[PDB]
Amino acid sequence: VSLTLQVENDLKHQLSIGALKPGARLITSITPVREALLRLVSVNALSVAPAQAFTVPEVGKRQLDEINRIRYELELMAVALAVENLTPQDLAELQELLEKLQQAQEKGDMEQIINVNRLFRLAIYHRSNMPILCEMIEQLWVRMGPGLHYLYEAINPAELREHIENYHLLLAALKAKDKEGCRHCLAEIMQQNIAILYQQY
Amino acid sequence: MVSLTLQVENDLKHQLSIGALKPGARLITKNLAEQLGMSITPVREALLRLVSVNALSVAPAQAFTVPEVGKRQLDEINRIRYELELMAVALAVENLTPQDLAELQELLEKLQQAQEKGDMEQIINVNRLFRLAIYHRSNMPILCEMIEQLWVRMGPGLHYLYEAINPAELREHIENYHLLLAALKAKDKEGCRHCLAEIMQQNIAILYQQYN
Incomplete structure (x- = not known):
């Protein structure tokens, strides 16, 4: 059925x-x-x-590289289109999620860290009103997904403290309706997070 | 298997x-x-x-x-594949062999024959085969599969072509394909992007006639 x-x-x-x-x-x-x-x-x-x-x-390095290269283009596209549609209520909900993220990092809950990050970014991308673009981004997340298992195995959530700062900057850029700023902030987020993932190789 | x-x-x-x-x-x-x-x-x-x-x-x-597939959906699919196909074509340039180029030239001849014969399905299919042959040399299988996926999604929007478009009115549209192949041969990355963008723009313009 x-x-x-x-x-x-x-x-x-x-x-x-x-x-x-x-x-x-x-x-x-x-x-x-x-x-x-x-x-x-x-x-x-x-x-x-x-x-x-x-x-x-x-997922080997070459394949993760390919996946990151593609989603780089697609996720930056999504964030640029979402900027012009975000409402005050949207931004408030994003601030709430960012607080949840801080809690997870402080509690050392890697499961919650990954999940809240997922919801935060997907909540932004969905507001682009480009559902097919979002489908494509989620597909790529599924493909690189097994690459995230390493976080549970080797990464201590305490060393992820400073990583939340780029999220505040992205939300600030979104609040200011700064399109190019959003793209830069999101690229920075992706870059720092991928750098963590590459350690498994 | x-x-x-x-x-x-x-x-x-x-x-x-x-x-x-x-x-x-x-x-x-x-x-x-x-x-x-x-x-x-x-x-x-x-x-x-x-x-x-x-x-x-x-x-x-x-x-x-x-x-x-309404105009709104076709719009979104086109915007997405625009970036992906231009990315694919730029990466393919540094990997194209004389043998690759020889086979692209053969596909182009098939395309012309298809337009002269008035075979709309073959025109559509050979255009697909031509671009995919290019994209595959980017050595990005996931990028190529995603491009194929988006072609499947916009696909029903092409049904209009069989009923309403006279293949004779597509004669001049093959020149952009010649220009793209020349750009690929000259290893001109930006020329390849420009020709492929022109190809997409002119083909999309035809598809939009169905929403009038």
Whole structure:
């Protein structure tokens, strides 16, 4: 029915927040679940070797580079289009999320850090009124998603204190309706976050 | 490996991409399985794969519909693919071999023949094959797949071409393709971007006539 599509959405989400380790084996009603996993294989959100079990993809440096290069263009496009549509209520909700992010970093909750970051940025991009652009960005997040698992393994959230500052600057740039400033702030955010991710190589 | 499901999926992507399926059309899984001489299973899965990327919509009673592509949606898809295709073409320049260029020249001849013969489907298809052959040399498979994905999404918007556009009025449109190939041969990055942008602008202008 429409259950299998929902199972797929749930797995895409787990992949996106780095909840699944690269190379890990996923153990599969079971029928629509298996159907969702095979559909995810077909878009390379998951891997399978012939006649064997589903696995979380391995994302090498070259592939992460390619993904970052593409989303760089798309996410900066989204933020530039969102600037002109953000309402006072939008900005207030973004400030709230930024406070949630600070809490997560202070609590040392890496799960919440990743999740709040996701919602903060997606909340911005959605306000661009470009739903297809946002679809494309989420697809890329799913592909680089297994690359985020490293955060849980090696990264101490205490060393992420200064990283929240670029978020305040982005929100300030959004509040000031400064389009080019938003692009610079978002590029800075992506750059610093990717630098953390590259340590796994 | 060859999968029946993948084969149906790629054929449906191709049909969508070249404008062979009309916006809003109701696709019946059973009809398609009968037409392909296949079990329902790989046909239904292929259709659901397209639903999962929003290339098709779910319809009542084991069926699907081809999405409606309004000007607003075509606008968004064009804006997105504009950046991606220009990025693809610029990266492909430093990797194109004499052999690559030779095959691009052959595709261009096919395109001219298609326009002279008045074969609208072949015109559309060869344009696709030509640009994709270029993009593949960017060595960015995910970028190329995403570009193909966006062509699938705008695809139903091309159905208008078969009914309303006289292929004879597209004669002069092939010159931009010659110019693009020359720019690729001369390794001129900005010239490639400019020619490809011109190609897209003129082709899009034709598509917008359907919303009048």
